[PDB]
Design a binder for this molecule. Structure first.
Ligand SMILES: N#Cc1cc(Cl)c(F)c(-c2cc(-n3cccn3)ncn2)c1
Ligand SMILES: CCCCCCCC/C=C\CCCCCCCC(=O)O
Ligand SMILES: CCCCCCCC/C=C\CCCCCCCC(=O)O
Ligand SMILES: CCCCCCCC/C=C\CCCCCCCC(=O)O
Ligand SMILES: CCCCCCCC/C=C\CCCCCCCC(=O)O
Length: 409
């Protein structure tokens, strides 16, 4: 009885239980919310099935402190290792497929704008010079500021990842272009006249705006004051008419006509330009962890050594802990990659923060746990804190909006 230990003077096991209890209730609350309102755009725009896996992993995460705090039974040693090992995997291997999809969608977004300027501005697969005379390659991607031709080749090789000999490919020219795209977005967001317009437009229309930036410059696009206001108020047809009167339209009519047309329809007509599949991959990554756990049940049979001490050695803990680490690393990688993606009410920003914190919790866990003489309680708290952070940062914001702010939805 945890109460007894509290009466004895040890408040550790009674605290871990309450922590778990408050966590189970919280998870129970959030899940029910996503069930009732499963038709609302805040829940429908994401992956409903993956959450059911992420929420289930968190639930078992809290159920762990009932295996670390229990009557001395043999199967509870089994439930421990199988709960501390798989529960994170069910959350991070289902989240990695989410972040990977998010990253794959984004990568395809940058693919379209690349094919946009390749047609509108052009491309060179070998090093050349611009008007200013500096060494350049691809779609106007500056390599270096030195007169040395050798300087451009070094910067290029370091930039690509191989010995290019001053010659690249379309895919490698896309890589360098991705950099120039992001650098352009930075300037736009730091331009007071261009920022509100960029924020209002959709995905396709943002590419049309950047196109104009890569032609006339930030200071130039700001010259379209009246036109930009029309676009921000979503007056496309008026904006097109207004833009077809500009010197920019009369000076470069072939290109401008296409950029303008993109503004009109919000599509790529002017240019020649799976949910079940994720459920199998998530299932696979979970089974891999299960295999490691089952294997360690065979190699090292669990045995009983309020507190339930199991004979679980270091290897019994390190190997699954290592595997989860990779799951977390993959997540954080794709999460940071999609951190600025505003899809699903800027959902990605919460996912990035969660992984950041999770990385810190798990790195700190290694020296603390393996250097502790109170490993079970450090396990309980570490485990619940990790499950709580995932729940608090990813789902509570979704749950807040769906209960407190119905109209925003
Ligand atoms: N070894 C080890 C180890 C180390 C840390 Cl720091 C953990 F947080 C966990 C953990 C995490 C979860 N989570 C469930 C949802 C989110 N986390 N469940 C169970 N154990 C295990
Ligand atoms: C909401 C608050 C509910 C959360 C926890 C209350 C339950 C605590 C149960 C501890 C009892 C342990 C025991 O009986 O030894
Ligand atoms: C209401 C909440 C009740 C929680 C009760 C569980 C506490 C005891 C379980 C662990 C143990 O066996 O010591
Ligand atoms: C949760 C259920 C998932 C897995 C249970 C399987 C564990 C069996 C491993 C064999 C143990 C042994 O060989 O001693
Ligand atoms: C952000 C990274 C994700 C989390 C890190 C993963 C932690 C697991 C990886 C390796 C831990 C190192 C091996 C364990 C040290 C053994 C200590 C000992 O038994 O004396």
């Amino acid at each position: 009885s945890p109460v007894q230990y509290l009466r004895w003077g040890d408040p550790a096991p009674i605290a871990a239980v309450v922590f778990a209890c408050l966590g189970l209730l919280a998870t129970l609350f959030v899940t029910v919310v996503f069930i009732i309102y499963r038709d609302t755009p805040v829940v429908k725009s994401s992956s409903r099935e993956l959450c059911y896996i992420i929420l289930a992993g968190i639930c078992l995460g809290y159920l762990c402190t009932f295996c670390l705090i229990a009557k001395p039974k043999q199967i509870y040693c089994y439930l421990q290792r199988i709960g501390i090992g798989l529960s994170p995997a069910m959350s991070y291997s289902a989240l990695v497929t989410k972040t990977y999809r998010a990253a794959r969608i984004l990568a395809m977004s940058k693919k379209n704008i690349f094919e946009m300027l390749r047609i509108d501005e052009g491309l060179r697969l070998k090093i050349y010079k611009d008007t200013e005379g500096y060494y350049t390659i691809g779609i106007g991607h500056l390599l270096t500021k030195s007169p040395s031709l050798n300087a451009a080749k070094s910067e290029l090789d370091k930039a690509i990842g191989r010995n290019t000999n001053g010659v690249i490919t379309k895919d490698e020219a896309e890589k360098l272009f991705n950099q120039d795209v992001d650098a352009a977005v930075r300037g736009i967001l730091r331009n007071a006249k261009l920022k509100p317009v960029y924020d209002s437009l959709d995905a396709v229309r943002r590419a049309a705006l950047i196109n104009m930036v890569f032609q006339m410059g930030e200071t130039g696009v700001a010259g379209f004051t009246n036109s930009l206001r029309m676009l921000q108020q979503k007056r496309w047809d008026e904006a097109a008419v207004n833009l077809a009167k500009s010197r920019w339209y009369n000076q470069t009519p072939n290109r401008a006509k296409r950029v303008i047309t993109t503004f009109r329809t919000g599509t790529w007509d002017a240019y020649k330009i799976s949910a079940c599949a994720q459920l199998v991959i998530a299932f696979i990554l979970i089974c891999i962890q299960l295999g490691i756990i089952v294997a360690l049940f065979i190699m090292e049979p669990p045995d009983i050594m309020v507190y339930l001490i199991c004979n679980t050695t270091n290897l019994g803990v390190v190997a699954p802990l290592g595997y989860n680490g990779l799951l977390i690393l993959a997540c954080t990688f794709y999460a940071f990659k999609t951190r600025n993606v505003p899809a699903n009410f800027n959902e990605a920003k919460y996912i990035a923060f969660t992984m950041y914190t999770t990385c810190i919790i798990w790195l700190a866990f290694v020296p603390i746990y393996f250097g502790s003489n109170y490993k079970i309680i450090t396990m309980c708290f570490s485990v619940s804190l990790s499950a709580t952070v995932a729940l608090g940062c990813m789902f509570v914001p979704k749950v807040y909006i769906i209960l407190a702010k119905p109209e925003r939805n």
